[PDB]
Design a protein around this ligand. Structure first.
Ligand SMILES: OC[C@H]1O[C@@H](O[C@H]2[C@H](O)[C@@H](O)[C@@H](O)O[C@@H]2CO)[C@H](O)[C@@H](O)[C@H]1O
Ligand SMILES: CC(=O)N[C@H]1[C@H]([C@H](O)[C@H](O)CO)OC(C(=O)O)=C[C@@H]1O
Length: 623
């Protein structure tokens, strides 16, 4: 928890009580565990929803859906049960509650079981299952001079009639919501991401929506891959963005422009970025994922635990910030090495809060946190992004001004800032490490066996922000060479292994004053010429498994070659700059490099000429 932020234990394990109703009688009852938190804002009133696990934390036991609410931003709360289970046996339950806010109503979706003691994904049929919808109505009043509020909960309705017996190539079994909070799309529709089983017991995700305020429901035709569960969704620039959990694997994210009729993997932005454990081979988790507007810029907020300990413990809850381009680690929200899996984040009247799980010996509470510090840091990063995007967009490029320098899809920038061992990211997400570097205006100058810089890719570890590079990228720089080499030496490139011996795409130079471009594993043909002391402009592109190299804006011989054998998907290790940064490799490069830019797509020709023509104008030096 950052400096300046604080919390309280709100749903207190083995302490807080709720109004348990049975046989027309109501009694205040102490609860063992609270889980599956969901935190929202209804027209001025804060509401918190979750699971009340009466007797034990075991998933298949006695559970009702509880609610708490406040009109003073979290100093005081009232308590109630919003949805009760069927009362048929000692293990009846309503599970995984998923919430939508619209006008002054709360729409809550839950599964309902009568008596099974087995985990739901292992049932062979639906004999014990039902799926339901309850609506709560929120009204405000002021009797006494001070604000008040009440909430009236309606009886649940089954939506079973809207589940077809068959989908494309399978037979249906059961379905449930994805937990946490869902959304109202910009056309008015109610939209719930859902998880479904079929008769072979495989799990997968769909879109489940309503056009008549929840009176009827439909399914979109498409689906995620088998193995994706507990999905969570938001709306961005006209698409639904669906974010999934996959046990024992890196997380998959999908895009859809038509209410779920067609699904496409987000290879160029967010898919495969977040892993469930340092080696990504442990159970996954539930996540909060919303779109909000801060100081006039729209952005996304996402949380997930790092799970250093393993299995289901899921310690160290982290918060991330992104604009669908750059991706920044806000930090750790939980405290110390405690266990902390599920979570919910809310932005209200310009303040940030989080409701989340804590776990000691399989006994669970929900704490409520005021994230004053997290928001401070966020605002600082958003200003820096806005400032550098504005600076670059305002430069008068030469012919009266030519076309503008592009910032769409720009991800990283290495320029004037540097310490003794790092080259700093102007966008503040990923730095590069260095050796034998001497600082100069807007760049670095290297020399000797072992010199150069390294901008990590798969080397980032658990969470990999530049995974898009395995699908498409553009890399740009200015360079000058100071000594004719003995053999062939490296200048800039993308490497598949950690030495730099297995290249995907790169550029070197040799003793006969020629360039040596390198296309994957293809045999190397030297070409063109250069003079010492002369400044040159360099660009590398890769898309659709094809790579290119430009000098001063023009493509060299051999451009247009295959860099990925149609076989698999590349796993890039790092980009190397002005050397391999490896003492064990024999080359010695004596060169200066300035202003390195990284983009998540292949640039167009006009975009390349402007960048070339405007080299002397973009450094960060004056600021
Ligand atoms: O740690 C609590 C979680 O248990 C998970 O269930 C595990 C269970 O702990 C393990 O012993 C074995 O039975 O495999 C189960 C996975 O299906 C639940 O999935 C999770 O909801 C937590 O309750
Ligand atoms: C078991 C169940 O009905 N609810 C569980 C839920 C569920 O498995 C998922 O929503 C569908 O796979 O997830 C988890 C979990 O962290 O493993 C805890 C919930 O108690």
């Amino acid at each position: 928890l950052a400096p300046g932020s604080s919390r309280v234990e709100l749903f207190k394990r083995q302490s807080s009580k709720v109004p348990f109703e049975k046989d027309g009688k109501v009694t205040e009852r102490v609860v063992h565990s609270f889980r599956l938190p969901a935190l929202v804002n209804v027209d001025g009133v804060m509401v918190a929803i979750a699971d009340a696990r009466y007797e034990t934390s075991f998933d298949n036991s006695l559970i009702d859906t509880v609610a708490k609410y406040s009109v003073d931003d979290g100093e005081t709360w009232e308590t109630q049960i919003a949805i009760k289970n069927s009362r048929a046996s000692s293990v009846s339950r309503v599970v995984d509650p998923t919430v939508i806010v619209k006008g002054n109503k709360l729409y809550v979706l839950v599964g309902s079981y009568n008596s099974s003691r087995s985990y739901w994904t292992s049932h062979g049929d639906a004999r014990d299952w039902d799926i339901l919808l309850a609506v709560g109505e929120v009204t405000k009043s002021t009797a006494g001079g001070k604000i008040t509020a009440s909430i009236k909960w309606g009886s649940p309705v089954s939506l079973k009639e809207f589940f077809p017996a068959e989908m494309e190539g399978m037979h249906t079994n059961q379905f449930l919501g994805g937990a946490g909070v869902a959304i109202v799309a910009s056309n008015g529709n109610l939209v719930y991401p859902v998880q479904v089983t079929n008769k072979k017991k495989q799990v997968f995700s769909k879109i489940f929506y309503s056009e008549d305020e929840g009176k009827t429901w439909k399914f979109g035709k498409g689906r995620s891959a088998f193995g994706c569960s507990e999905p969570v969704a938001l709306e961005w620039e006209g698409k639904l963005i669906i974010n999934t959990r996959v046990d024992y694997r890196r997380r998959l994210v999908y895009e859809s422009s038509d209410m779920g009729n067609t699904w496409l993997e987000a290879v160029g932005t967010l898919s495969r970025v977040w892993g469930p454990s340092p080696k990504s081979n442990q159970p996954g988790s539930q996540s909060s994922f919303t779109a909000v507007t801060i100081e006039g810029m729209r952005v996304m907020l996402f949380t997930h635990p790092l799970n250093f300990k393993g299995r289901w413990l899921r310690d160290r809850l982290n918060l991330w910030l992104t604009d669908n381009q750059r991706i920044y680690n806000v930090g750790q929200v939980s405290i110390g090495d405690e266990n902390s899996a599920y979570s919910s984040v809310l932005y209200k009247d310009d303040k940030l809060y989080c409701l989340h799980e804590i776990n000691s010996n399989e006994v669970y509470s929900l704490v409520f946190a005021r994230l004053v510090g997290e928001l401070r840091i966020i605002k600082s990063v958003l200003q820096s992004w806005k400032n550098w995007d504005s600076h670059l967009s305002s430069i008068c490029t030469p012919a009266g001004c030519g076309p503008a320098v592009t910032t769409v899809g720009l991800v990283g920038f290495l320029s004037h800032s540097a310490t003794k061992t790092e080259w700093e990211d102007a966008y503040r997400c990923v730095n590069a490490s260095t050796a034998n570097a001497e600082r100069v205006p807007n760049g670095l100058k290297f020399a000797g066996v072992g010199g150069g810089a390294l901008w990590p890719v798969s080397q980032q570890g658990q969470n990999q922000r530049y995974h898009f590079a395995n699908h498409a990228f553009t890399l740009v720089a200015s360079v000058t060479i100071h000594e004719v080499p003995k053999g062939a030496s490296p200048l800039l490139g993308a490497s598949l292994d950690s030495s730099g011996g297995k290249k995907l795409l790169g550029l070197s130079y040799d003793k006969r004053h020629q360039w040596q471009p390198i296309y994957g594993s293809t045999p190397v043909t030297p070409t063109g010429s250069w003079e010492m002391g002369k400044r040159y402009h360099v660009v590398l592109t890769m898309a659709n498994k094809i790579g290119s190299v430009y000098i001063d804006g023009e493509p060299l011989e051999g451009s247009g070659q295959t860099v990925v054998p149609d076989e698999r998907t590349p796993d890039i290790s790092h980009f190397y700059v002005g050397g391999y940064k490896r003492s064990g490799m024999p080359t010695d490069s004596r060169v200066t490099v300035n202003n390195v830019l990284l983009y998540n797509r292949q640039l167009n020709a006009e975009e390349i000429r402007t960048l070339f023509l405007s080299q002397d104008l973009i450094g960060t030096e004056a600021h």
